[PDB]
UniProtKB/Swiss-Prot annotation:
Species assigned in the record: Clostridium perfringens (strain ATCC 13124 / DSM 756 / JCM 1290 / NCIMB 6125 / NCTC 8237 / Type A)
Gene name of the record: nagJ
Stretches for region Catalytic domain: 139-424
Keyword Coiled coil in record: yes
Family of this protein: Belongs to the glycosyl hydrolase 84 family.
Documented effect of changing residue 351 to A: Strongly decreases affinity for 4MU-NAG. 99% decrease in activity for 4MU-NAG
Superkingdom of source: Bacteria
Function summary: Binds carbohydrates. Capable of hydrolyzing the glycosidic link of O-GlcNAcylated proteins. Can bind and deglycosylate O-glycosylated peptides from mammals.
Lipid biosynthesis as UniProt keyword: no
Protein name: O-GlcNAcase NagJ
Enzyme superclass (EC): hydrolase
Active-site positions on this chain: 253
Result for mutant: residue 253 to N: 99% decrease in activity for 4MU-NAG
EC number(s) on file: 3.2.1.169
Length: 722
């Protein structure tokens, strides 16, 4: 048997044997001395997979040994054979399965728990492979930061997430926001709701962090003043009695922008609580300026960050989002900049998959853009999730592999492992849907994540290239039709089979991708209709394709803007029939550069605003004027579009003489005529004919220059069609 899909990926793993089958009843060794929470997770796993534990010793059955380095078990070390956990760092484990004996050794209590979750992933229908493993995390504090606007998570969503973190090896969870009666507002009747969260966090080796956001109405001056300050600590002390070992004070929105007053609250709280108890974990906080753009300028730091960094105690943890609030990448250079200001290892608030800024689109991509050496300056990782809790698991899954094993991380593969595991048989169909909903961008200040459906985008671009170059795309068109049908097939089967927990969060988004897919089908119909010269079917398909986009742009759900949605819009703006540049080598009789930058290049530029002008500066070239367009390859053409200078009358072509050629030296003729004097774009139409050089000899032009008739020649755009 082979190694199943693991998460996170262990540091060291090697296939020593083939594999063995697990017996229906086994015997466990080392329950009493081992971690209590680590065995509880293992005991129920055996119950769920129909496995029982023997009361007395049995040589016929398989033996599962578990414990710590602290514990002195002669059975465990013998089953290890040259393998130890003492050489590993905190929260590390060492798993070894060989010849009906599975030994697991952790460094401490936390480490042994993560050894149990690897055993659960290796076992597939009671068939565990034979491999030796030595493993340890790259980041110490890995987890989630619940801080999204809108409707908060429910209690059953939270409890489900706690268990999900432990199995995928994550040890942090921050409460807040949002509008709890106690956190911001008024910071027995609601004791249980918070109590159940802490007890479950202890069972899954996760440090429960309590958040506080008093910024909007906190006071610094006065008695009270001290009274508010005294009334800070007691709020936390109640939770310390409930079992909370981590606390935090947030400044994410404050307005009252005084770093000396914010640090005063943090620093004295660091003395009167976390060091005063001896129980407590280090203090966590978020300054008012958290993004590098708002933090530094430009850069050495702004007025706020200078005072804040130089006041706050080095022991305190500080969170920052990156180059931006919702930014694409976090390069190591940015990490060096922020960490240099604070002179400590910073904590990260990664805003993905959080969709509180762009609620329409879902975020189902991996950890994209983060530098692989981020563990150097950062030893505290947290992500901001979506308000949709079930689907937030896919990105969090990728967060586990990044934070734990950073140097070997691969975002594309870790993404595929997230969907394969969380869905099972229904993974491949979900992959197609999630593939289109990864790139977050509100077309302004927020953008992050992996690009949507790139493979499909390259092919879409490949279609417009081969359409605008005479080339036959029958093979590519056939594949596209199938690709858009695969989208509609996957989205429907998902709708017929998803657990509501998931279905209710993405029901509108499944209907959206289908509407786009159908539009993409209707888009190819137009392209086929243009190649077959079936204008009736073209307009009929155009009727459908336009409606799908209109219903898509009206519908609340948003998905695959760049790829699936934009493909419909491109098929509507495609002429073509143009070819179209650009492409190639426009040349002219005379051009202006000295007086104004308007050379012959701007004649076939594509930009409607830019124009070409004949040489009017002294010594001026007063015609006869002519444009000569070089074609990329020979093309059949039956229409020459002329867009005259819009802003000015100077040099409008009111008389032309178009010629064609295949060598560039010997031109012929195709049409001679005049054009009505105005700013309207003229279409010169003649019979289809192959050509590699398109000439436009000007026989008449006008201008507002007294006796400037025929002295000048200006063209905003000149290009051929066929
Ligand atoms: Ca112990
Ligand atoms: Ca939409
Ligand atoms: Ca132009």
């Amino acid at each position: 048997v082979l190694v199943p899909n693991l998460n996170p990926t262990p540091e060291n793993l090697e296939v020593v044997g083939d594999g063995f089958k697990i017996t229906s009843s086994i015997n466990l060794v080392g329950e009493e001395e081992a971690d209590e929470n680590a065995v509880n997770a293992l005991r129920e796993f055996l119950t769920a997979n129909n496995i029982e534990i023997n009361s007395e010793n049995d040589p016929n059955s398989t033996t599962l040994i578990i414990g710590e380095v602290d514990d002195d078990i002669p059975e465990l070390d013998e089953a290890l054979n040259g393998t130890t956990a003492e050489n590993l760092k905190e929260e590390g484990y060492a798993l070894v399965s060989n010849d009906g004996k599975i030994a697991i050794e952790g460094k401490d209590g936390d480490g042994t728990f993560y050894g149990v979750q690897t055993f659960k992933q290796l076992v597939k229908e009671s068939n565990i492979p034979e491999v030796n493993i030595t493993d340890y995390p790259t980041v110490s504090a890995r987890g989630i930061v619940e801080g999204f606007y809108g409707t908060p998570w429910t209690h059953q969503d939270r409890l489900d997430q706690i268990k999900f973190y432990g199995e995928n090896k994550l040890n942090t969870y921050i409460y807040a926001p949002k509008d709890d009666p106690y956190h911001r507002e008024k910071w027995e009747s609601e004791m249980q709701r918070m109590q159940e969260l802490i007890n479950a966090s202890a069972e899954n080796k996760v440090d429960f962090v309590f958040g506080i956001s008093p910024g909007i109405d906190i006071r610094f001056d006065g008695d009270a003043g001290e009274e508010d300050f005294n009334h800070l600590i007691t709020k936390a002390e109640s939770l310390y009695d409930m079992g909370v070992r981590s606390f935090a004070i947030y400044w994410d929105d404050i307005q009252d922008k005084s770093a000396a007053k914010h640090a005063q609250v943090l620093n004295r709280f660091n003395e009167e609580f976390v060091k005063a108890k001896g129980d407590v974990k280090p203090l966590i906080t978020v300054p008012t300026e958290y993004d590098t753009g708002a933090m530094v300028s430009n850069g050495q730091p702004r007025a706020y960050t200078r005072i804040f960094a130089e006041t706050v105690d080095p022991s305190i943890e500080v969170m920052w989002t990156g180059p931006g609030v919702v930014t694409n990448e976090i390069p190591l250079s940015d990490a060096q900049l922020i960490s240099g200001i604070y002179n400590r290892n910073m904590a990260v608030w990664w805003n993905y998959p959080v969709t509180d800024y762009f609620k329409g689109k879902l975020a189902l991509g991996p950890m994209h853009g983060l530098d692989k050496g981020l563990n150097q300056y950062v030893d505290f990782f947290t992500v901001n999730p979506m308000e949709h809790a079930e689907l937030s698991k896919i990105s969090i899954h990728t967060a586990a592999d990044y934070s734990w094993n950073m140097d070997n991380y691969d975002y594309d593969k870790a993404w595929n492992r997230a969907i394969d595991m969380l869905y099972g048989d229904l993974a491949e169909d979900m992959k197609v849907f999630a593939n289109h909903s990864t790139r977050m961008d509100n077309k302004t200040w927020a953008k992050s994540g992996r690009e949507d459906a790139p493979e499909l985008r390259a092919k879409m671009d490949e279609l417009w290239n081969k359409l605008s170059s005479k080339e036959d795309a029958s093979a590519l068109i056939e594949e596209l039709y199938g690709e858009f049908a695969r989208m509609e097939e996957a989205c429907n089967n998902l709708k017929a089979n998803l657990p509501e927990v998931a279905l209710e969060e993405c029901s509108r988004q499944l209907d959206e991708l289908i509407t786009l897919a159908q539009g993409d089908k209707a888009s190819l119909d137009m392209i086929v209709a243009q190649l077959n010269e079936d204008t009736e079917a073209y307009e009929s398909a155009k009727e459908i394709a336009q409606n799908k986009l209109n219903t898509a742009l009206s519908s609340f759900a948003v998905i695959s803007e760049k790829v699936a949605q934009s493909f419909i819009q491109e098929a509507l703006s495609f002429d073509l029939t143009l070819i179209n540049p650009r492409t190639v080598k426009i040349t002219a009789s005379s051009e202006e550069t000295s007086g104004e930058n308007a050379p012959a290049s701007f004649a076939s530029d594509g930009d409607m605003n830019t124009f070409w002008h004949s040489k009017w500066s002294s010594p001026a070239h007063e015609g006869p004027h002519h444009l000569t367009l070089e074609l990329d390859n020979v093309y059949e053409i039956n229409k020459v579009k002329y867009a005259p200078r819009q802003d000015s009358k100077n040099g409008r072509i009111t008389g032309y003489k178009v010629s064609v050629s295949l060598d560039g030296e010997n031109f012929t003729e195709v049409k001679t005529g005049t054009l009505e004097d105005n700013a309207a774009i003229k279409f010169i139409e003649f019979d289809s004919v192959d050509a590699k050089y398109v000439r436009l000899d000007v026989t008449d032009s006008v201008s507002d220059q007294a006796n400037g008739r025929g002295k000048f020649a200006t063209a905003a755009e000149v290009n051929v069609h066929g």
